[PDB]
């Protein structure tokens, strides 16, 4: 996705549907951000309990 956007930057603007595809992608990847950060918290208390 990074290389496809780095190539098709402005075409993202020209094409409308790809923009909201990106929007839902941002939403879900923020959800995964939260998942991964909670996993890091999991790291924390497991390292405590061990």
């Amino acid at each position: 996705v990074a290389v496809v956007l780095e190539l098709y930057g402005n075409t993202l603007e020209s094409s409308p549907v790809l923009q909201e595809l990106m929007i839902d992608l941002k939403t879900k990847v923020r959800h995964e951000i939260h998942k991964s950060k909670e996993a890091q918290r999991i790291e924390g208390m497991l390292q405590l309990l061990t």
């Binding site: 950060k37 909670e38 890091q40 918290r41 999991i42 790291e43 924390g44 208390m45 390292q47 405590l48």
Partner: protein
């Protein structure tokens, strides 16, 4: 190139204060980057890029800091939950 000089000053200040709790300087920086990254890269070749690698080294140190910090955040949260169970 007034924006370039602003970029230079902002980068110098950010390097001097890597752990500044303010957000105005980072947000000005990130608008400036997300608008004019290419012309930024084409401005200069030696001094601006050397400052860029200085700041990037600082930022990578911060990124290295981040995960242990999140772990201690989870430690604090679970200790809070433990205190809640203690009082209940």
């Amino acid at each position: 190139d007034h924006l370039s000089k602003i970029f230079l000053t902002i980068s110098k200040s950010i390097t001097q204060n890597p752990w500044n709790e303010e957000n105005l300087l980072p947000l000005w920086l990130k608008w400036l980057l997300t608008l004019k990254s290419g012309e930024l890269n084409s401005i200069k070749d030696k001094h601006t890029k050397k400052n860029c690698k200085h700041l990037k080294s600082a930022l990578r140190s911060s990124e290295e800091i981040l995960p242990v910090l999140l772990g201690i955040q989870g430690r604090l949260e679970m200790l809070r939950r433990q205190a809640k169970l203690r009082e209940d």
